[PDB]
Amino acid sequence: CGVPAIQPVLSIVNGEEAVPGSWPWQVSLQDKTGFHFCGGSLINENWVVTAAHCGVTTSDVVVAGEFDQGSSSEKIQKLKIAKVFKNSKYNSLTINNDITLLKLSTAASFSQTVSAVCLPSASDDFAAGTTCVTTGWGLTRYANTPDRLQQASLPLLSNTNCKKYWGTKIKDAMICAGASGVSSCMGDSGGPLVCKKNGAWTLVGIVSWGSSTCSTSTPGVYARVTALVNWVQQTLAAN
Amino acid sequence: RPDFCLEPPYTGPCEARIIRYFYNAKAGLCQTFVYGGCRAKRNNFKSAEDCLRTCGGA
């Protein structure tokens, strides 16, 4: 996990186009018509982790191996969803514990453009200031979504610095990043916020919420995976 | 009809791209809009029919 067959080239609003297939765990969650409503991350061949607010159902599909959503010829894997596991602690009012697991009906065929992201340990500590990356097909301007997968490097923010703006809206299962010239935006939800752990890309956050206009000078908020990974492991073990 | 039917559509702070319907009093019909996935206001419906049954004529 966490090691792309195709290495990404570093250096979403104000982000940049990604090297095709360089973020193999990135998936697109679409309805039966092919309409993209959220992103997600493959954690293995049978499970996808996304945001709870995305409201995924078994009628939606997981699309893996995609780069250009405007390309009808591009080879991709449309995977059906067998069951949806929304974290029962998801707070629809505070948006805390914003995580959901998707169990695929048919396993994804891992390849050069389709593989898993690593999951952190509940005790992992990713220092504030750490430069991580987020990806997705969300708006590039706050408007239709870009056809090609976007990426952006951004720093993790300490809870103290994040709260300097969001105050008490920041809860224990949330982690902030951004306010650095880039910003996740509509369509990026459920997508990954990854940081390297011993050289391997690891899921530190899940795009959740933020500025109502996707301001690049405001902290972006993500579901803190370290606070939710035990729930993830328990769910996988029991299913 | 409820006054919430007269409120403009509310995307919210979450970053999903979910299609929902809201009643547009200026046009007299329910239109689609992108909902972010959280903190929906009441003029937000999952189908045009639900919207028209709740806000039609406001």
Description:
The complex is a heterodimer of chains A (239) and B (58). With 239 residues, chain A is mainly β. In chain A, strands 8-9-10-13-12-11 form a six-stranded antiparallel barrel. The radius of gyration of chain A is 16 Å and the shape is globular. Chain A has two helices and 13 strands. Chain A folds into two domains: 122 residues, Trypsin-like serine proteases (Thrombin, subunit H, Beta Barrel); 104 residues, Beta Barrel (Thrombin, subunit H). With 58 residues, chain B is α+β, with helices and mostly antiparallel strands. Chain B has a single domain, classed as Pancreatic trypsin inhibitor Kunitz domain (Factor Xa Inhibitor, Irregular). Helix content of chain B is 14%, strand content 24%. Chain B has a two-stranded antiparallel sheet. The interface between A and B is medium-sized, with 26 and 14 residues. The PDB classes it as hydrolase/hydrolase inhibitor. The entry lists the keywords chymotrypsin, serine proteinase, bovine pancreatic trypsin inhibitor, non-cognate binding, primary specificity, crystal structure, hydrolase-hydrolase inhibitor complex. It forms a dimeric assembly.
